[PDB]
Write a protein that binds this ligand. Structure first.
Ligand SMILES: COc1ccc(/C=C2\S/C(=N\c3cccc(O)c3)NC2=O)cc1O
Length: 328
């Protein structure tokens, strides 16, 4: 069988927390008053929810309301429990309330409002200094949630809300987040395709917080190299092939051999043989202002096949790439 794996940090956080902390199936929701909130405009829709701008009429403050579509109550309680556990943490979106929507007959989560710019437009604009600053702010959120025993499992640009005017950042959309427990096998159908870690793409279920660090590396690569998304696969199989054309096939085989993993035989006709590339090949005159030796070294240490070899969020915050960021 496959070789087991443990997180190298925050391994036992939930072990020594009280059961109530991570036992979300037993959580009892504290419902607020649904008539406190007036919906203003729809902001988005997905398979599992719709999101709205709204006004809290008890204080005339803007909020954001996510009205769930029907989904297992276990997963609704999981997201609620995680948001309450993380509330107040650095750059974590604040859950302000939970109400029952009378039309949907489902829960509606009420969040603080961020005056956001779309990443497609914001990313055409950020400077080298901006990218370092906001990467540091994301790391604060990720080290916090990892230190609290939670993996996000859907890190991607669409889930990082930035109010550039106030240099304010919030990590949102905790609907896929999970509690880390040593030895637990997790669903690999998480994260967006372009941000899926190799562990998901080879069906290794005993993964951990380090998944979020791969996803963050994909974001960093897209920003400093001006290629969004960086690994642009047409499906989950091609996604691994795109990664292997950069990291090389020999280290992919080292990875699956370490964990006694077997590749899907459908890769026999599509994977090929690929050397590992040097990151300098992705530098050109239109992105070199965003690239430095420090950026390439930092990126290189996030994008490792072996989830046990990636920088932790705390280690990443120690990296020389962040030396120029003003610390508060
Ligand atoms: C404009 O400011 C904000 C925007 C979003 C949030 C929080 C969200 S949105 C989400 N999930 C989605 C995303 C897209 C479509 C959809 O139907 C559901 N999960 C969250 O926590 C908070 C804000 O302050």
């Amino acid at each position: 069988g496959p070789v087991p794996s443990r997180a190298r940090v925050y391994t036992d956080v939930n072990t020594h927390r009280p059961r109530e902390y991570w036992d979300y199936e037993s959580h009892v929701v504290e419902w607020g008053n649904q008539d406190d909130y007036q919906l203003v405009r729809k902001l988005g829709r997905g398979k599992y929810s719709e999101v709205f701008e709204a006004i809290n009429i008890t204080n005339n403050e803007k909020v954001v309301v996510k009205i769930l579509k029907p989904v297992k109550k276990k997963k609704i309680k999981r997201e609620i429990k995680i948001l309450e556990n993380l509330r107040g943490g650095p750059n974590i979106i604040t859950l302000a309330d939970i109400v029952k929507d009378p039309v949907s007959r489902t829960p509606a989560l009420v969040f603080e409002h961020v005056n956001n710019t779309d990443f497609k437009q914001l990313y055409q604009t950020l400077t080298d200094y901006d990218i370092r600053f906001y990467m540091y702010e994301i790391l604060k959120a990720l080290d916090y949630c990892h230190s609290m025993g939670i993996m996000h499992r859907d890190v991607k640009p669409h889930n990082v809300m930035i109010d550039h005017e106030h240099r304010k950042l919030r990590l949102i959309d905790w609907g896929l987040a999970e509690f880390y427990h040593p030895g637990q096998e997790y669903n690999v159908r998480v994260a967006s395709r372009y941000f899926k870690g190799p562990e998901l793409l080879v069906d290794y279920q005993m993964y951990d917080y380090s998944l979020d660090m791969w996803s963050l590396g994909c974001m960093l690569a897209s920003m400093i190299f001006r290629k969004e998304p960086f690994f642009h696969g047409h499906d989950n199989y091609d996604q691994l092939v795109r990664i292997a054309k950069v990291l090389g096939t020999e280290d992919l085989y080292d990875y699956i051999d370490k964990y006694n993993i077997e590749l899907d035989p459908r890769f026999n006709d599509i994977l090929g043989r690929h050397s590992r590339k040097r990151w300098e090949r992705f530098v050109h005159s239109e992105n070199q202002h965003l690239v430095s030796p420090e950026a390439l070294d930092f990126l290189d240490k996030l994008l490792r096949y072996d989830h046990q070899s990636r920088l932790t969020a705390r280690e990443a915050m120690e990296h020389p790439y962040f030396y120029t960021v003003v610390k508060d």
